[PDB]
Amino acid sequence: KETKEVYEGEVTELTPEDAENPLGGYGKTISHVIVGLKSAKGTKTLRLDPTIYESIQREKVSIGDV
């Protein structure tokens, strides 16, 4: 027996939140990725570690559908 914690819903917009690079650099350095949430009987909005950039590399569903 075990338990897992999962966040799920519908994403209004899938776009990482850019921020200044802590090291002397250029371009865009993501500090957080805002993920929209939408579910029946409960709906919020949250942000995540920009490491999911590789996770969002291949989903092939829609623009934040489920």
């Binding site: 209004t12 929209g36 909005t45």
Partner: peptide
């Protein structure tokens, strides 16, 4: 050393309002 925590929390708090689909 501690001010960045408050800065991040408050900026996330203020960005959570307009991003919320309330209208």
């Amino acid at each position: 050393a501690m001010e960045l925590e408050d800065r991040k929390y408050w900026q996330e708090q203020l960005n959570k309002r307009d991003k919320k689909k309330k209208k």
